[PDB]
């Protein structure tokens, strides 16, 4: 698991469950290729998106469907979605945790990059 | 101003000056059309991007070139840019402030929406 | 102003109005001495807390009464208050802006420090 | 483990290791009693601070010595420390995760409160 996504809800102080996540990779065409997707589970995590073989250097985009999450709760949100765009670079083994902290009119995203 | 962007630097405790910002509007073809651009000035703000007449209902993207900002300081940051995507003016004209707080591996963005 | 406090609400996308703020300075006895207080006004700001002459070197505490803010809105929040503690003016006089972004279970605080 | 503390470094995109944490409980005297302490480990977590028997309803303070952490890295920080003050309330089983995201001039803190 070189790539993990974790989503938290700052209004309720809870993991954000059932949030759709889409991952894209920038293709030679300079367009965004579907790469992986999933919905967050009870602890607000999405595991198993990819494997070390497939997760080669490149530019990746992580799209989190925050608007549907707030709409389920009855809260009118500002953003259409939250996007995280980054380069993956070989340099030691790397694991990536992309964390997102959600409010209706604000979000924070942080990357924790560790080397096992 | 109907649209104002404010950018702060969490490492130095200072406004983020000379940050490039590009604004796009989603067209009828579902492509992103260039709408306005500029660079933050010394208080970390960008004003004058649009007028009330031009700033019609639509889906807008604000792209903040964070990577160039950190590289000019000697830091290799995680994100390629910070992107904020939102529906604007769909219940009438509003005034939008988009704020971004920058760190090398993390950013936060908040919207303040007022009714003129 | 040598000291300004700005408070935003991440749930509503709005400045946080009528929030009580108390400022304390650490005394020679290591107790917290009351220094200034006030309430945020409609743009979410509190000005006029002190003067350059009064705002000497020291350790200062800014206490933001977040709990009362959320309770007046019907929400039972996690934190009792938000506290910001910092050394001020130790290399000469500076101008401080203390910003706080509020959600029910999360808050962020940032300092912007400028040299007059 | 009803209480866990997790500390992240937004400059380096890493867990914040060896950060001192002190936990206090508000005593009948209305003063702060030492309750638990520790230093964060490699994944930036502090476990084992207390037990369900001892963690009764009350007001608790968590103090994170952020200033020493930045000083070790050669970065001049703004805050003396980060403080988190909250009430623990019986109402179902509750576990508390206090998360802190650190930058030199900014920090965020979030509570994730779950019921097993």
Author numbering:
A (entry chain B), B (entry chain A), C (entry chain A), D (entry chain B): 10 to 125
Copy the relevant paper text:
Human transthyretin (TTR) is a 55 kDa homotetrameric protein that transports thyroxine (T4) and retinol-binding protein (RBP) in the serum and cerebrospinal fluid. Wild-type (WT) TTR is intrinsically amyloidogenic, and causes amyloid fibril formation in elderly individuals, resulting in senile systemic amyloidosis (SSA). Tetramer dissociation is thought to be the rate-limiting step in amyloid formation. In this paper, native MS, neutron crystallography, and computer simulations have been used to investigate the effects of the T119M and S52P mutations on TTR stability and the molecular determinants of amyloid formation.
On the other hand, individuals carrying the S52P mutation develop aggressive and early-onset fatal amyloidosis. The highly amyloidogenic S52P mutant has a proline residue at position 52 in place of the serine present in the WT. The lack of a main-chain amide-H and a side-chain hydroxyl group in the proline residue prevents the formation of two hydrogen bonds and causes a loss of stability of the protein. The same distance is 0.4 Å wider in the S52P mutant, implying a looser CD loop. However, the β-turn between the C and D strands is loosened in S52P-TTR, suggesting that this location is crucial to the reduced stability of this mutant. However, a large and statistically significant ΔΔGmono ( + 2.1 kcal mol−1) indicated that the introduction of the S52P mutation had a destabilising effect on the monomer with respect to the WT-TTR, corresponding to a shift towards unfolded TTR by a factor of ~34. In contrast, the free energy calculations described here provide evidence that the tertiary structure of S52P-TTR is thermodynamically less stable than that of the WT. This, together with structural (neutron diffraction) and dynamical (simulation) evidence of a loose CD loop, suggests that unfolding events at the CD strands are likely.
